[PDB]
Design an enzyme around this catalytic site. Structure first.
Site, mmCIF file in Angstrom:
data_model
loop_
_atom_site.group_PDB
_atom_site.id
_atom_site.type_symbol
_atom_site.label_atom_id
_atom_site.label_comp_id
_atom_site.label_asym_id
_atom_site.label_seq_id
_atom_site.Cartn_x
_atom_site.Cartn_y
_atom_site.Cartn_z
ATOM 1 N N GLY A 11 20.638 68.204 -1.081
ATOM 2 C CA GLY A 11 19.555 69.090 -1.449
ATOM 3 C C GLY A 11 19.934 70.509 -1.831
ATOM 4 O O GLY A 11 19.111 71.425 -1.694
ATOM 5 N N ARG A 90 17.670 57.112 -8.032
ATOM 6 C CA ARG A 90 17.063 55.850 -8.441
ATOM 7 C C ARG A 90 16.594 55.915 -9.886
ATOM 8 O O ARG A 90 16.105 56.949 -10.349
ATOM 9 C CB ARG A 90 15.877 55.482 -7.540
ATOM 10 C CG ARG A 90 16.196 55.420 -6.060
ATOM 11 C CD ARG A 90 17.171 54.302 -5.753
ATOM 12 N NE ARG A 90 16.583 52.992 -6.006
ATOM 13 C CZ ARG A 90 17.224 51.844 -5.814
ATOM 14 N NH1 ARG A 90 18.472 51.855 -5.369
ATOM 15 N NH2 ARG A 90 16.621 50.690 -6.065
ATOM 16 N N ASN A 106 15.173 66.123 -14.913
ATOM 17 C CA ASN A 106 16.326 65.642 -14.137
ATOM 18 C C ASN A 106 17.516 66.545 -14.339
ATOM 19 O O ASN A 106 17.688 67.081 -15.431
ATOM 20 C CB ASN A 106 16.707 64.216 -14.550
ATOM 21 C CG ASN A 106 17.890 63.668 -13.758
ATOM 22 O OD1 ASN A 106 17.854 63.606 -12.527
ATOM 23 N ND2 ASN A 106 18.935 63.243 -14.466
ATOM 24 N N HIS A 108 21.703 66.565 -14.306
ATOM 25 C CA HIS A 108 22.809 65.626 -14.413
ATOM 26 C C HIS A 108 24.091 66.429 -14.566
ATOM 27 O O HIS A 108 24.134 67.354 -15.363
ATOM 28 C CB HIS A 108 22.618 64.694 -15.614
ATOM 29 C CG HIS A 108 23.723 63.703 -15.787
ATOM 30 N ND1 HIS A 108 23.778 62.520 -15.086
ATOM 31 C CD2 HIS A 108 24.823 63.723 -16.577
ATOM 32 C CE1 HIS A 108 24.868 61.855 -15.430
ATOM 33 N NE2 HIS A 108 25.512 62.561 -16.341
ATOM 34 N N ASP A 142 15.170 55.416 -21.148
ATOM 35 C CA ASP A 142 16.616 55.288 -21.254
ATOM 36 C C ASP A 142 17.286 56.361 -20.397
ATOM 37 O O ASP A 142 17.112 57.557 -20.644
ATOM 38 C CB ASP A 142 17.048 55.406 -22.717
ATOM 39 C CG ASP A 142 18.493 55.020 -22.937
ATOM 40 O OD1 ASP A 142 19.075 54.352 -22.059
ATOM 41 O OD2 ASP A 142 19.041 55.379 -24.002
ATOM 42 N N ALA A 172 26.518 76.096 -11.438
ATOM 43 C CA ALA A 172 25.784 76.139 -12.700
ATOM 44 C C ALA A 172 24.456 75.390 -12.584
ATOM 45 O O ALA A 172 23.434 75.829 -13.141
ATOM 46 C CB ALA A 172 26.630 75.559 -13.835
ATOM 47 N N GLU A 173 24.466 74.262 -11.875
ATOM 48 C CA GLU A 173 23.243 73.479 -11.682
ATOM 49 C C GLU A 173 22.165 74.351 -11.069
ATOM 50 O O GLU A 173 20.999 74.301 -11.471
ATOM 51 C CB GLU A 173 23.484 72.272 -10.781
ATOM 52 C CG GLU A 173 24.445 71.248 -11.366
ATOM 53 C CD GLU A 173 24.564 70.017 -10.483
ATOM 54 O OE1 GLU A 173 23.529 69.571 -9.946
ATOM 55 O OE2 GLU A 173 25.689 69.493 -10.326
HETATM 56 N N1 LIG Z 1 14.132 55.836 -16.382
HETATM 57 C C1 LIG Z 1 14.961 56.867 -15.905
HETATM 58 N N2 LIG Z 1 15.198 56.982 -14.557
HETATM 59 C C2 LIG Z 1 15.987 57.961 -14.091
HETATM 60 N N3 LIG Z 1 16.405 58.320 -12.783
HETATM 61 C C3 LIG Z 1 17.200 59.379 -12.880
HETATM 62 C C4 LIG Z 1 17.857 60.079 -11.686
HETATM 63 C C5 LIG Z 1 19.319 59.742 -11.639
HETATM 64 C C6 LIG Z 1 19.469 58.269 -11.366
HETATM 65 C C7 LIG Z 1 20.942 57.856 -11.551
HETATM 66 C C8 LIG Z 1 21.162 56.548 -10.740
HETATM 67 C C9 LIG Z 1 22.307 55.724 -11.366
HETATM 68 C C10 LIG Z 1 23.125 55.107 -10.210
HETATM 69 C C11 LIG Z 1 22.355 53.930 -9.594
HETATM 70 O O1 LIG Z 1 22.571 53.626 -8.420
HETATM 71 N N4 LIG Z 1 21.395 53.213 -10.421
HETATM 72 C C12 LIG Z 1 20.598 52.084 -9.970
HETATM 73 C C13 LIG Z 1 21.488 50.963 -9.473
HETATM 74 C C14 LIG Z 1 22.566 50.677 -10.511
HETATM 75 C C15 LIG Z 1 23.913 50.584 -9.843
HETATM 76 O O2 LIG Z 1 23.996 50.600 -8.574
HETATM 77 O O3 LIG Z 1 24.971 50.487 -10.549
HETATM 78 C C16 LIG Z 1 19.606 52.513 -8.916
HETATM 79 O O4 LIG Z 1 20.005 52.923 -7.795
HETATM 80 O O5 LIG Z 1 18.359 52.463 -9.164
HETATM 81 C C17 LIG Z 1 17.311 59.752 -14.126
HETATM 82 C C18 LIG Z 1 16.592 58.925 -14.957
HETATM 83 C C19 LIG Z 1 16.329 58.790 -16.336
HETATM 84 O O6 LIG Z 1 16.782 59.544 -17.178
HETATM 85 N N5 LIG Z 1 15.512 57.771 -16.794
HETATM 86 N N1 LIG Z 2 22.859 61.043 -11.941
HETATM 87 C C1 LIG Z 2 22.291 62.195 -11.262
HETATM 88 C C2 LIG Z 2 23.341 62.963 -10.499
HETATM 89 O O1 LIG Z 2 24.516 62.614 -10.519
HETATM 90 N N2 LIG Z 2 22.896 64.013 -9.815
HETATM 91 C C3 LIG Z 2 23.796 64.936 -9.170
HETATM 92 O O2 LIG Z 2 23.801 64.739 -7.756
HETATM 93 C C4 LIG Z 2 24.100 65.979 -7.100
HETATM 94 C C5 LIG Z 2 23.040 66.237 -6.033
HETATM 95 O O3 LIG Z 2 23.392 67.363 -5.233
HETATM 96 P P1 LIG Z 2 22.304 68.056 -4.255
HETATM 97 O O4 LIG Z 2 21.706 66.905 -3.466
HETATM 98 O O5 LIG Z 2 23.147 69.051 -3.491
HETATM 99 O O6 LIG Z 2 21.292 68.693 -5.184
HETATM 100 C C6 LIG Z 2 24.054 67.056 -8.178
HETATM 101 O O7 LIG Z 2 25.394 67.343 -8.608
HETATM 102 C C7 LIG Z 2 23.294 66.366 -9.287
HETATM 103 O O8 LIG Z 2 23.518 66.911 -10.597
#
Ligand SMILES: Nc1nc2[nH]c(CCCCCCCC(=O)N[C@@H](CCC(=O)O)C(=O)O)cc2c(=O)[nH]1
Ligand SMILES: NCC(=O)N[C@@H]1O[C@H](COP(=O)([O-])[O-])[C@@H](O)[C@H]1O
Length: 200
Positions: A11, A90, A106, A108, A142, A172-173
């Site tokens: 967080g 997620r 979001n 990243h 996507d 930076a975030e």
């Molecule tokens: N529709 C959509 N959902 C979003 N969630 C997040 C926020 C960032 C989400 C990145 C999570 C990737 C790692 C992961 O664990 N993904 C899956 C399982 C796949 C795997 O384990 O390989 C999951 O946990 O649901 C960003 C974002 C987005 O731009 N589009």
């Molecule tokens: N795919 C999304 C991703 O990788 N998010 C990354 O998780 C960290 C969370 O840190 P925080 O819990 O200290 O904010 C941050 O570096 C964020 O950009």
């Protein structure tokens, strides 16, 4: 504008958003913090700041759509306008993303479109870039492909590890996520009808 912050972990981004949204000229207020994981430090930070928290365990739901529905119910309960994903790990379902289109941000830890996915720093280090960074973007179906709002470049130093690189990129975030939230909450930036980012 009323904001929900969704988290899965430490967080630090949440804390930067808490600090920024409490400045007098902030156009955003954080009204609820939602975690999909119990007992994470982000929940402590929210409670310390006097912000309500909810834990919605994705592992208790049959599928993604049911989980997202549980999130959405809390968003409606708190009359939320804007959702910030701040280390929330997620993937959100299509209909949830569409409902919140233009209203969900979001962070990243790469310069998108490079290094999409869950391990961006590992990718950056394996590839051997000397410049990485972070990106705040609108969430589209996507993953990591939605419209970019702000980015900041961060150097990669010789000998960096995920530990040292992520630390540098988080500095930076913590700048661009508050700035991006303020841009959207103030109505300065919106997702255009053509789907592209619009600076009003
Ligand atoms: N529709 C959509 N959902 C979003 N969630 C997040 C926020 C960032 C989400 C990145 C999570 C990737 C790692 C992961 O664990 N993904 C899956 C399982 C796949 C795997 O384990 O390989 C999951 O946990 O649901 C960003 C974002 C987005 O731009 N589009
Ligand atoms: N795919 C999304 C991703 O990788 N998010 C990354 O998780 C960290 C969370 O840190 P925080 O819990 O200290 O904010 C941050 O570096 C964020 O950009």
């Amino acid at each position: 504008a009323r904001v929900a912050v969704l988290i899965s972990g430490t967080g630090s981004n949440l804390q930067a958003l808490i600090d920024s949204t409490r400045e007098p000229n902030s156009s955003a207020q954080i009204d609820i913090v939602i975690s999909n994981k119990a007992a994470v430090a982000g929940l402590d930070k929210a409670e310390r700041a006097g912000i309500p928290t909810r834990v919605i365990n994705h592992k208790l739901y049959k599928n993604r759509v049911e989980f997202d529905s549980a999130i959405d119910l809390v968003l409606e309960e708190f009359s939320i306008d804007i959702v910030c994903l701040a280390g929330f790990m997620r993937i959100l379902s299509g209909p949830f993303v569409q409902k919140w289109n233009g209203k969900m941000l979001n962070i990243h830890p790469s310069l998108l479109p490079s290094f999409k996915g869950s391990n961006a720093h590992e990718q950056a280090l394996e590839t051997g870039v000397t410049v990485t960074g972070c990106t705040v973007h609108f969430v589209a179906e996507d993953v990591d492909a939605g419209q970019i709002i702000l980015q900041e470049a961060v150097p990669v130093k010789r000998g960096d590890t995920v530990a040292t690189l992520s630390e540098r990129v988080k500095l930076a975030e913590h700048k661009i996520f508050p700035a991006a939230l303020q841009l959207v909450a103030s109505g300065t930036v919106q997702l255009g009808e053509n789907g592209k980012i619009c600076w009003v």
